[PDB]
């Protein structure tokens, strides 16, 4: 797999708020064939949704309920893409 | 859709031991298009690995380092499959 050819980016790979959807995109168009694995690890369980869009992009959203530091990993054919894993601080509301 | 058509089973959905790979299988062949999501929650960080086999089955293994009770979630298209979440006792080695 051409994990090195995959790119991801967006606010959900930078900062998030507890209980609020954190969103980012993945572009695998130049990578060829492969499977994606998206992992979120930290103080509570993530709900993850994925949208295979018609426009050459893959939309990801996750929500976690507890504040704290989360690690977001994006792997293509089981290799970390560039910049993965991402450390994301999730703040407590207010 | 599809989650009600998925099945999972194996030793890792029943009981495990700290530091030993806990293994189970998922069969989503009858469920059609979709994303599988697996989660493990309890008193220590899980390392989760996944093998998409060419044989109609998906293999999963997790390892956790601390004994205690863990929950294992298997969802297909954002919905729990039958019997998920699973509660798994993890014993000392």
């Amino acid at each position: 797999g051409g994990a090195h050819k995959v790119r991801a980016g967006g606010p959900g790979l930078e900062r998030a708020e507890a209980g609020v959807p954190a969103e980012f995109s993945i572009w695998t168009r130049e990578a060829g064939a492969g499977g994606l694995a998206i992992a979120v690890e930290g103080p509570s369980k993530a709900e993850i949704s994925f949208e295979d869009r018609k426009d050459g992009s893959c939309g990801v959203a996750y929500v976690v309920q507890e504040p704290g530091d989360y690690e977001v990993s994006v792997k293509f054919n089981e290799e970390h893409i560039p910049d993965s894993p991402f450390v994301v601080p999730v703040a407590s509301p207010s | 859709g599809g989650a009600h058509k998925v099945r999972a089973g194996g030793p890792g959905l029943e009981r495990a031991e700290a530091g030993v790979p806990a293994e189970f299988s998922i069969w989503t062949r009858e469920a059609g298009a979709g994303g599988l999501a697996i989660a493990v929650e309890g008193p220590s960080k899980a390392e989760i690995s996944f093998e998409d086999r060419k044989d109609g089955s998906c293999g999963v293994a997790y390892v956790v380092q601390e004994p205690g009770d863990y929950e294992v979630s298997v969802k297909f298209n954002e919905e729990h499959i039958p019997d998920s979440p699973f509660v798994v006792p993890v014993a000392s080695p």
């Binding site: 930290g42 993850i48 | 309890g42 989760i48």
Partner: peptide, 9 residues
């Protein structure tokens, strides 16, 4: 409780 949540597709 800590958690690892993985999505595969």
């Amino acid at each position: 409780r800590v958690a690892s949540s993985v999505f595969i597709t």
